[PDB]
Amino acid sequence: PSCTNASSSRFMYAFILLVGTVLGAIALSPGLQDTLKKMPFCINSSLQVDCEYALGYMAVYRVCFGMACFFALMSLIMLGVKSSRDPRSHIQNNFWPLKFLICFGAAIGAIFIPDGSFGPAMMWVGLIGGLAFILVQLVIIVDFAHSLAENWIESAENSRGYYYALAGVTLLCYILSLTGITLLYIYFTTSTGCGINKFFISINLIFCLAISVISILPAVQERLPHSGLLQSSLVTLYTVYLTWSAVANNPEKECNPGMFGHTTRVTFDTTNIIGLVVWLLCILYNCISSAVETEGVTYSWSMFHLVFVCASLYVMMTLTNWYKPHSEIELFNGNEASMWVKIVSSWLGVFIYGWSLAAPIVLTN
Amino acid sequence: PSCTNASSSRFMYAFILLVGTVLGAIALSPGLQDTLKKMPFCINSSLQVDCEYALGYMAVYRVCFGMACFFALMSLIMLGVKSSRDPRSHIQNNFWPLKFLICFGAAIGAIFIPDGSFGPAMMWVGLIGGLAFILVQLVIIVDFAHSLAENWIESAENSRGYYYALAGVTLLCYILSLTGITLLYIYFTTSTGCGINKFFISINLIFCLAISVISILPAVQERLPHSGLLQSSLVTLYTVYLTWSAVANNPEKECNPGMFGHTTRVTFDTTNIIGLVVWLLCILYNCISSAVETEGVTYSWSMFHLVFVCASLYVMMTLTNWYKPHSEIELFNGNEASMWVKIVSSWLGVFIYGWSLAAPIVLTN
Amino acid sequence: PSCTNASSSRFMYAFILLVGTVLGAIALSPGLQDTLKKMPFCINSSLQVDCEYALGYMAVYRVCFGMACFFALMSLIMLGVKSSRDPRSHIQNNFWPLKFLICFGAAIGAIFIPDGSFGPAMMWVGLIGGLAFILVQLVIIVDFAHSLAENWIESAENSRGYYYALAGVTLLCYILSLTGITLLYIYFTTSTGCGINKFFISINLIFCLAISVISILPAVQERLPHSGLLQSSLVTLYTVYLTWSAVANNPEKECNPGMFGHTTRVTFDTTNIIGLVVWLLCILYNCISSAVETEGVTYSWSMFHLVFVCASLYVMMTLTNWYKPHSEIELFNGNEASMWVKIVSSWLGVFIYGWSLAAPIVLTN
Ligand SMILES: CCCCCCCCCCC(CCCCCCCCCC)(CO[C@H]1O[C@@H](CO)[C@H](O[C@@H]2O[C@@H](CO)[C@H](O)[C@@H](O)[C@@H]2O)[C@@H](O)[C@@H]1O)CO[C@H]1O[C@@H](CO)[C@H](O[C@@H]2O[C@@H](CO)[C@H](O)[C@@H](O)[C@@H]2O)[C@@H](O)[C@H]1O
């Protein structure tokens, strides 16, 4: 009755966000839209280089602003709700076409916003939202790892069917992370040119070893028996991903060969694909009867919409490769304020996991 | 059954007003529509300067007139209702697409109204509606402040979690208001040129201090214990906002540097954004099971629609920056009849709050 | 169940008539449609002056003919009904989109009717319908005045809240009527040129004084205590309105300064706006559970549709300012057959009220 319709609503909102992202990403195609994008919002006209070179980025900004506003509004409405008997529960579950048309309407109206001062404000808002959503998806990954490891250990160790896979998953994740760290050492640093990259990569490797060291010692396993190695494995893979994605945006042509060492600067590579896939997996696991974010409500109706606002901003930032608006083309898709945010996010996430796993042991002895 | 559908209707009307405002504001874009707006309603042709320079303003007038008429009509229908069993309750809750199409139909029909005598009449109607809605939203803000302060004081003071925030909110609002009053002193007045601004700002500061002085004395707190400082803080912030918005329209180029000291005169700044945000918050708090505006009806079905008529007129005025139609471009977006209305509204609002807070104390001793 | 759906139907028919009137009045715009109106129905071509000068008038005729036919047909169907159990009750309440599409379909089909002999026949039909609907709305106004005066006197005189308003309404209506009669004396007559206007205005003033004299004497109040002054006040205001609207169409350039003393002759002034507002108020008060026009039916299903036919014809006539088709432009929007109909309607209405108020007193003594 009520619960199944509420969960169907939780999935309908995910479908809304998905349709919005797919519609936003149809832009920035190499030649199929970069000439069509000249009509919609540059009729108003360091501004000229941005209107002339990167059109898909502006289109993505104007599209995702609409979804951010829609989900912020839905968060403001569903504020203070206590039980499923409130009259506002009736508007969250029934009227779907109105919601679709409002969301898209907002996108179409926002596309008319001219350029000149809209860029940088949204860059800062996107940085904040990206930090928030990175931390949220780290929490989701940790919860999923706990659940999976516990389930396989409890249900499978009576047999030999899943134990092999239980070892193989963590072995494959470790070898992927190690090959990735070696590829970083090989490519994204020189002999004596860039030291900051040799600092970032090395300190992330140190944290990724200390985390798996602390995750196994028996004093922690005494409280919960399933400390295992899978959790630390998935976490270290994710942290290596963030290390690579953060070093990718180094605004120094001395060493960085990614972009620095052409009629456009909009690019789409394997990095963005991996990012979107991890994003989608986290969003779907958030909606499957989970709160890893009659009387009583399972999930707070406002925190859910706030999480979707953060997710929409994260998509805004990751589809545009975290660039700085109104910058000359020689700088070419790299800013300095994004790498620090990403790497501080990675460090805070490693701290969160290492603390939540071994807080009382350190508090006592 | 009945109540949940009635509240869903109260929110559907807010969605109607929101869609109308968003559609009205897509106009007045700097170059994306100012050339398209030449066909619709100037084919008829101090009138020529208005048709040639400010097209977005006329489009906004013609759009918002339709919503004003629609909500006035809905107010006239739902007149005299007593209980939820009347046959007219069936038409207020069910037929939504007809209502959407009637409202938009009215907008599309009104866009055909030619120029020449339509402007000034609507300017006066908009002034009256703006006065009414400013006072309404002041009442809503005062009620919200009472509710929030009472809730936090009663539920939180047993702990230390919210007391810090209870002090921080009022501290932040006070520092914002003080920095704003200082910025007004710095910018919107000269040494010896404009004295009327040094009068308005100073007298508003005097009222904003006396209000917080009276809000704290123990004789008033004897009746209600939660007199506090949050109410006076939010009220003084709102009054400083109105002081700034009223001084912005001074029709004197001697001192005012806002607009006085270009192919168009339609502008959109941070002032309009703050105005629209406060507007939206007040409209949403009006609809959340509140009447701060089986047998018996919670809210009078006609007063609600009258409040929405006033709200639509207020949007009409604030999206067009309160200008005077059919005025030469040198005057440039400033009239004299708006500043007096805004400031008299501010003074009457301060009087309303100061009276409602300390009426019986003054009546007795 | 049945009653609420029947009343919703009574309001849906009013919405149909409103949408039809709004669509008909979008025409006759000064330049926005007078060039577009050259294609639709003059491809067929004292006829040429009407096709060349007044296009909005013909468009309004062709539009309102469709609604007249639709409501006449609905009147013919719902003939002889006795109870709410007849099978024809099922078609009056359910199938709305079909009705909308039939009505508009009829309008679109009627727009194809060519010119040459369609004008004058519809002028005479419109005169008859206008007489009928003027008398109907007079009856509605009298009933409303009785209801309002009785309600305020019975519920309010225990207090002092509404007595002031009960006097103020009648005072304001009297002063409006007197200023109007003086403005007529000043403007619409000369010193010795037009005597027929000095006859009409003076005799209407005499009737409007005698009516208020008879409405107060105690012999009439003996039967019903609420004879009062409000009824006579609203009635005399309405009669002064009809006097002004009838004198406006005097086909004499000697005195009349309204139109007599330009590429078109279609005009739209404050007269038409007041007319449409009074029309809308009467139509809405007709539908609010009233018959001022299980077993048993409250309102006769055929008389309602006949009243709407008369209303549609009245709108047809008042949107076109009661002009004579196929007349030379020098005559310019004034005919002689309309003023007599309007003024005879006014006199018959004053007679109806004066009789219904004081019939038995005169019959006995
Ligand atoms: C829920 C809310 C729904 C809101 C809907 C709003 C719809 C707004 C439509 C906006 C839009 C299409 C783009 C839409 C993008 C949508 C993206 C959707 C994405 C997801 C799917 C309309 O395109 C217009 O194009 C015009 C081309 O002539 C037509 O003009 C016809 O002839 C006219 C002769 O005067 C008549 O006047 C008009 O009547 C006619 O028609 C217009 O009819 C037409 O509307 C904008 O197109 C633009 O095209 C350019 C010429 O390429 C226009 O001209 C430029 O303007 C100067 C300004 O400074 C420039 O400096 C200059 O270069 C140039 O002069 C622009 O002005 C603008 O119009």
Ligand SMILES: CCCCCCCCCCC(CCCCCCCCCC)(CO[C@H]1O[C@@H](CO)[C@H](O[C@@H]2O[C@@H](CO)[C@H](O)[C@@H](O)[C@@H]2O)[C@@H](O)[C@@H]1O)CO[C@H]1O[C@@H](CO)[C@H](O[C@@H]2O[C@@H](CO)[C@H](O)[C@@H](O)[C@@H]2O)[C@@H](O)[C@H]1O
């Ligand atoms: C629920 C109610 C629904 C009611 C719907 C009503 C729809 C009314 C449409 C109105 C409108 C579009 C704008 C609509 C704006 C909508 C805004 C919506 C906003 C939210 C989304 C129709 O545009 C017309 O444009 C014409 C252009 O030629 C076409 O003419 C075609 O060829 C013809 C050859 O003779 C045929 O005769 C016709 O048959 C053909 O088709 C018309 O077919 C077309 O309809 C008005 O456009 C205007 O365009 C201009 C030329 O730019 C027209 O010419 C001007 O008029 C003089 C007058 O004095 C001017 O002095 C002069 O400069 C010029 O001569 C205008 O007259 C007017 O037409």
